[PDB]
Amino acid sequence: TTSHRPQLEARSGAKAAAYTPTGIEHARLLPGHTTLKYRKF
RNA sequence: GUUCGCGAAGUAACCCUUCGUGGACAUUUGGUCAAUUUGAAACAAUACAGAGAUGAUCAGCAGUUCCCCUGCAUAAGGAUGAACCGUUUUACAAAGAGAUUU
Ligand SMILES: [K+]
Ligand SMILES: [K+]
Ligand SMILES: [K+]
């Protein structure tokens, strides 16, 4: 059977760059650690 | 409509009452959209068949895809979700030999 295959190339992000996205709100993307820390001097 | 001012009629004259007249106040809603067949939802129903790696029965996890579905979801599930299984000819040259032709 040929359904079991090694990867010839990985799926590129350029394909998704052209897609029109949806407005789903992900739990991990909710506001958190909203302020950046900076070093002295 | 209200109110400020003016003409007038009524009244003995004011108040008050009416007809006329000027100014002030208040100033542009709503539709991406019409009410059954012809601008688009799907399941279901009838039939047949009964799931990959196998001699046999099965757990799977992935990858690739201009297939996605369920789910709050970057989780998980959907037959390992499904499809995958076919078709495949030239960067075409070098050395040499024996036959063909003037
Ligand atoms: K079966
Ligand atoms: K399985
Ligand atoms: K699965």
Swiss-Prot record:
Region Disordered, annotated ranges: 1-19
Compartments where located: Nucleus
Family the UniProt entry places it in: Belongs to the CWC15 family.
Function: Involved in pre-mRNA splicing.
Complexes and interactors: Belongs to the CWC complex (or CEF1-associated complex), a spliceosome sub-complex reminiscent of a late-stage spliceosome composed of the U2, U5 and U6 snRNAs and at least BUD13, BRR2, CDC40, CEF1, CLF1, CUS1, CWC2, CWC15, CWC21, CWC22, CWC23, CWC24, CWC25, CWC27, ECM2, HSH155, IST3, ISY1, LEA1, MSL1, NTC20, PRP8, PRP9, PRP11, PRP19, PRP21, PRP22, PRP45, PRP46, SLU7, SMB1, SMD1, SMD2, SMD3, SMX2, SMX3, SNT309, SNU114, SPP2, SYF1, SYF2, RSE1 and YJU2.
Protein name: Pre-mRNA-splicing factor CWC15
Residues of the full protein shown: 2 to 42 of 175
